[PDB]
Symmetry: C2
Amino acid sequence: MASMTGGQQMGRGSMGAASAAVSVGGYGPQSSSAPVASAAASRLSSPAASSRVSSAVSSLVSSGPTNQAALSNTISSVVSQVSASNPGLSGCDVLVQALLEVVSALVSILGSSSIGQINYGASAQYTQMVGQSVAQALAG
Amino acid sequence: MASMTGGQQMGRGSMGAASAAVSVGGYGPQSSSAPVASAAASRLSSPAASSRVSSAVSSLVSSGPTNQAALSNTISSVVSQVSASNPGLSGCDVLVQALLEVVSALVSILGSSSIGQINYGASAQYTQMVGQSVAQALAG
């Protein structure tokens, strides 16, 4: 991929373009928040997260994989319990864990489910469904 | 103090926990549990987010709705561009927007796709797929 860097002021490259290094330091330069998502993935791999993923499967499957009401139920329940395990973590960390855990549950549905014709235009509508579940769930 | 009238107990030693309290300049005034997800949903409803959702559809559909490589591509690309629009937002806000936007894309796939037999046991495996895409994508 090779990320892009600014013409001047920091943003030094890496790998190659240097036969030998004659500088001493610790942590290299940064641009995007990587370790945040990395940490979320690590605790996402925890046994607690995996169990919640399974529960997300049963909820969506029984109520309706593509139902507004069913999706709202899954987001609300998962966010609550994920907070219960992680009181030490900041409020933002709670939101991260709930959201990506919902992503994993949906992946499980796709693998078990069959893919037909993609209704590309309505993709925005389903986006509204997810945004709706967040607002209603945390609104009250 | 839930020491009594409750089978579960707490004593980790995390200086207690915050729940329903009023203070100014000390314990971080103005909490943010609900409104965090609410704000993420609001900007998720932005035209920029909807367009990215559509792009997520094409990526997963063409490469493979249930492919490890395809999922990694979607997460990496979306996270990058979502940061590009939102430089003003904190690093955590960037992660939130990318993650739930992936959730919405998956919902679009489910609505267009057909549901067969749910392989409940492998749900944990698909959870590993998502965690993997995060680690690799931001690890560089």
